Amino acid sequence: SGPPVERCGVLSKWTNYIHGWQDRWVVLKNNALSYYKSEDETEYGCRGSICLSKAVITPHDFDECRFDISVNDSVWYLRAQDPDHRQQWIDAIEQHKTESG
Amino acid sequence: FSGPPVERCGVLSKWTNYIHGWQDRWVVLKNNALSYYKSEDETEYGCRGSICLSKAVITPHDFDECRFDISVNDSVWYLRAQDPDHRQQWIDAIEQHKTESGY
Ligand SMILES: [Cl-]
Ligand SMILES: [Cl-]
Ligand SMILES: [Cl-]
């Protein structure tokens, strides 16, 4: 019964062992977390979207800026700038997931 | 009005002042408001302005066809899209959303 959760910003995202961690623009909307190469490249540049309905969000125990998001078919590994911002993201994603159900 | 609400997010240039001129902002149309976001570190963002659409006036510029202004009695934002087609997409979405959010 309150306003929907919204969030956008840059997160560092694991790509692969060739390029390692790379900054990506991440947007929370439409029961999804979506990412793009950058803020300016959203028109044609969605590089992925993870539906939140059954998504599991796991803060890391050793890398205190890291959280992982997983559905059956994929896992994204993400790092925020500090642990407070990590917690803001986790809290937003969880609140959005709840509200969208 | 029965389908999902009209929502948009994207970059638009926004007028600041004559020193810094047009500056890109992340702009969001949602829940009867146009809002914009800024960051001081290119990483973490926060909403730095919101306009309620109920009585908003959207004025496409006659000569600068990339520009539209949105005003309520107390405030005005001057906004540019990258071209006039993109301007029109924004204008049309805002005007439709305004109607659909009304009573
Ligand atoms: Cl949004
Ligand atoms: Cl251990
Ligand atoms: Cl542009």
Residue numbers in the entry:
A (entry chain B): 20 to 120
B (entry chain A): 19 to 121
Publication text:
In this paper, we report a crystal structure of the CERT PH domain and associated biochemical characterization in an effort to understand the structural basis of PH domain mediated CERT localization to the Golgi.
It contains a curved and twisted β-sandwich that is capped by the C terminal α-helix at one open end. Opposite to the capping helix, the other open end of the β-sandwich contains a bound sulfate, which likely originated from the crystallization solution that contained 1.0 M ammonium sulfate. The sulfate forms hydrogen bonds with residues K32, R43, Y54 and R66, all of which are highly conserved among many PH domains and involved in interactions with the PIP ligand. Nuclear magnetic resonance (NMR) studies show sulfate binding mimics 1,2-dihexanoyl (diC6)-PtdIns(4)P binding to the CERT PH domain, thus the sulfate bound crystal structure likely captures the major features of the PtdIns(4)P bound state. The two copies of CERT PH molecules in the asymmetric unit have distinct conformations in the β3–β4 loop. In molecule A, the β3–β4 loop points downward and K56 replaces R66 to interact with the sulfate. Structure B likely represents the major conformation while structure A a minor one.
